[PDB]
Scaffold this active site. Structure first.
Site, PDB file in Angstrom:
ATOM      1  CB  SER A 169      -3.411   0.187   2.306  1.00 35.06           C
ATOM      2  OG  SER A 169      -3.878  -0.116   3.396  1.00 35.06           O
TER       3      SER A 169
ATOM      4  CB  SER B  17       2.738  -0.431   4.909  1.00 33.41           C
ATOM      5  OG  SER B  17       2.754  -1.926   5.643  1.00 33.41           O
TER       6      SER B  17
ATOM      7  N   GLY C 199      -8.093   2.398   3.998  1.00 26.15           N
ATOM      8  CA  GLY C 199      -8.537   2.875   2.638  1.00 26.15           C
ATOM      9  C   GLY C 199      -7.362   3.609   2.160  1.00 26.15           C
TER      10      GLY C 199
ATOM     11  CG  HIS D 144      -2.330  -4.579   2.992  1.00 28.95           C
ATOM     12  ND1 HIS D 144      -1.219  -3.923   3.399  1.00 28.95           N
ATOM     13  CD2 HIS D 144      -3.323  -4.078   3.130  1.00 28.95           C
ATOM     14  CE1 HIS D 144      -1.845  -2.612   3.519  1.00 28.95           C
ATOM     15  NE2 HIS D 144      -2.996  -3.001   3.435  1.00 28.95           N
TER      16      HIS D 144
ATOM     17  CG  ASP E 231       2.310  -4.232   2.753  1.00 27.93           C
ATOM     18  OD1 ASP E 231       1.509  -5.050   2.131  1.00 27.93           O
ATOM     19  OD2 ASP E 231       1.298  -3.485   3.424  1.00 27.93           O
TER      20      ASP E 231
END
EC number: 3.4.21.12
Lengths: 4, 198
Positions: free
Chosen positions: B143, B159, B141, B36, B63
């Protein structure tokens, strides 16, 4: 829950 | 830029995420991160400079993404932990109950344990299945950042989480935190990536  | 897991990088001069792990696919340098965070061919930057572009990604459903880097990049088998580093030794999947830590540009290095596997997150864009839940805290932030045991076994990439209005889930007890990450192994075989280890 949230993506990032 | 030295590619270390947990550090910040921007996607198309706009969102931020964190580096998961240095990998190679043949002669190509790369890093795994979250799907993402960017679309295919979005431009990653580390400290203003362009380091690479999104080669592939899958989000939602999964993801996951990897960023192929220009060869100027220096891949390193580490994950940032303050001014220190954790060496990446391999990718043995730890079990539920095991202690695990994660690194990201917002909350830094945080540890907790793996609470459950194969969780479905129902994100606004669609479900992402097969995530592992741990209860270390994280924030917006983080991820794409590394999840790793202190023994150096790379577990996955950040994720999502049950975010509160302060943009993170560090102000609520571990018992209430649902911090989810994508398992590294499926990403690794799916793109034919080899993890850089030290």
């Amino acid at each position: 829950a949230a993506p990032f | 830029a030295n590619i270390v897991g947990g550090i910040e990088y921007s996607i198309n001069n706009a969102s931020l995420c964190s580096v998961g792990f240095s990998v190679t696919r043949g002669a190509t340098k790369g890093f795994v991160t979250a799907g993402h965070c960017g679309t295919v061919n979005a431009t990653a930057r580390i400290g203003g400079a362009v380091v690479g572009t999104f080669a592939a990604r899958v989000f939602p459903g999964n993801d996951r993404a990897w960023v192929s880097l220009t060869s100027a990049q220096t891949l390193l088998p580490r994950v940032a932990n303050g001014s220190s580093f954790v060496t990446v030794r391999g990718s043995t999947e730890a079990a539920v109950g095991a202690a695990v830590c994660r690194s990201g540009r917002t909350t830094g290095y945080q540890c907790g344990t793996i609470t459950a596997k194969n969780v479905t997150a129902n994100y606004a864009e669609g479900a992402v299945r097969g995530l592992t839940q741990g209860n270390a805290c994280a924030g917006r932030g983080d991820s794409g950042g590394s999840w790793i045991t202190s023994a150096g076994q790379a577990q996955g990439v950040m994720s999502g989480l049950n975010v509160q209005s302060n943009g993170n889930n560090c102000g609520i007890p571990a018992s209430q935190r649902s911090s989810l990450f994508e398992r590294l192994q499926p990403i690794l075989s799916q793109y034919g990536l080899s993890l850089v280890t030290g």
